Amino acid sequence: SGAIYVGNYRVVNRHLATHNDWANLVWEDSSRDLLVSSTTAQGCDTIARCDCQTGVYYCSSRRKHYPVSFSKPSLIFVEASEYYPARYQSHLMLAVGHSEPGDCGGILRCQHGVVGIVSTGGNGLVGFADVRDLLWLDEE
């Protein structure tokens, strides 16, 4: 589990979104595994605006933050997904690291702020749903 809290937005994995998230929907995309809902209180996070490929992510199944190198956002076939459709997610970034399903929502961050959230795992790889292209998160 985990979210990004930027302004009056809550960014979560679409497959973990709550009824309250869907009842307060701003934007959602199944292909990216992302959903954004409205908040009453302002959030503590800053979104990175950059093409960094190095950062640090939080892994709840280790209670640890790990430094990683990660690929640029792209289209990848996810094998045997079991919290959503199991085939071809977009705006995905991969790194070598540990990820189990409950790790979804952990933040990846660079020197510029939050890059994205854990969305996939398997075979010593971790995938992160990118948010750096969602410029509208910074305003309104």
Q: Which residues sit in the known binding site for Zn(2+)?
A: 50, 52, 110, 112
> With respect to ligand YZK, which residue has the nearer C-beta, 113 or 121?
121
Q: Smallest gap, in angstroms, from Cβ of residue 127 to ligand YZK? A: 3
Name which of 59, 133, 47, 51 is nearest 96 in CA terms: 59
Q: Which does 123 bind (CB under 5 to 8 A by kind): Zn ion, ligand YZK, none?
A: ligand YZK
Stretch that binds ligand YZK, among 5-13, 33-41, 53-61, 120-128 (CB under 6 A): 120-128
Examine residue 120 and tell whether it contacts ligand YZK (CB under 6 A).
yes
Any idea what DSSP says for residue 43? P
Is 59 catalytic? The answer is no
Question: Which sign, positive or negative, has the C-alpha torsion 96, 98, 104, 108?
Answer: negative
Residues 6+ apart with CB under 8 A from 53: 69, 70, 71, 72
Between 41 and 80, how does the x/- string for binding to ligand YZK read (CB under 6 A)? -----------------------------------x-x--
Q: Which does 125 bind (CB under 5 to 8 A by kind): Zn ion, ligand YZK, none?
A: ligand YZK
Residue for token pair 């979804």: 104
Q: Which does 127 bind (CB under 5 to 8 A by kind): Zn ion, ligand YZK, none?
A: ligand YZK
Rounded distance between C-alpha atoms, residue 101 and residue 119, angstroms: 8
φ, ψ at 57 (rounded to 5°): -125, 155
User: What residues between 81 and 110 interact with ligand YZK by CB under 6 A?
Assistant: 94
Q: Smallest gap, in angstroms, from Cβ of residue 126 to ligand YZK? A: 6
- Per the DSSP assignment, residues forming a β-bridge with 47 are 114
A 10 A CB-CB count for 74 gives: 12
